[PDB]
C-alpha positions in Angstrom: 31.9 -5.8 20.8 29.7 -2.8 21.9 27.2 -2.5 19.0 25.0 -4.9 17.1 26.6 -6.6 14.1 25.1 -8.2 11.0 28.1 -10.4 10.2 27.2 -13.5 12.2 23.8 -13.7 10.5 25.5 -13.9 7.1 28.0 -16.4 8.5 25.0 -18.5 9.5 23.4 -18.3 6.0 26.6 -18.6 4.0 25.9 -22.1 2.4 22.5 -20.9 1.3 24.0 -17.7 0.0 26.4 -19.7 -2.2 23.7 -22.1 -3.4 21.4 -19.2 -4.3 24.1 -17.2 -6.1 24.6 -20.4 -8.1 20.9 -20.9 -8.9 20.3 -17.3 -10.2 22.8 -17.5 -13.1 20.0 -16.9 -15.6 17.5 -15.0 -13.5 17.6 -11.3 -12.9 18.7 -10.5 -9.4 16.7 -7.3 -8.4 13.5 -5.6 -9.1 12.1 -2.6 -10.9 9.8 -0.3 -9.2 7.7 0.5 -12.3 5.9 -2.7 -13.2 2.5 -3.2 -11.5 0.0 -6.1 -11.9 -2.6 -3.7 -13.3 -0.5 -1.4 -15.5 -1.2 -3.6 -18.5 -4.9 -2.6 -18.9 -4.6 1.0 -17.8 -5.5 3.9 -20.0 -3.7 7.2 -19.5 -5.6 10.5 -19.4 -4.1 14.0 -19.9 -6.2 17.2 -19.3 -5.3 20.7 -20.3 
């Protein structure tokens, strides 16, 4: 080919991909960009 391809990498990690897809049946694949480790004890201030 003429360009760089990402298919052989996934071919390399295929067995791990299968196993991981099987291990995350009950977990939540993904992340939310709102939770932060300090947002539980924060106070919000609004100024007019």
